C-alpha cells in the first residue's frame, strides 16, 4: 500500500522484485 516509484504508464515496475506491483497506474507495495 505504498508507492514504490515507477509509473505503469511507460516504466515497468523494476521494484516488482521487492513485491511492487501496478496499482492505480503506479507501482505499489504494501
Which residues are CB-neighbours of 16 under 8 A, at least 6 positions away? 27
What is the rounded end-to-end Cα distance, in angstroms, of the chain?
4
Phi-psi region of 10 (alpha: psi -120 to 50; beta: other; left: phi over 0): alpha
| Residue showing cell 515507477 | 6
Structure method = NMR
Amino acid at each position: 500500500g505504498i508507492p514504490c516509484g515507477e509509473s505503469c504508464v511507460w516504466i515497468p515496475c523494476i521494484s516488482s522484485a521487492i513485491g511492487c506491483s501496478c496499482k492505480s497506474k503506479v507501482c505499489y507495495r504494501n
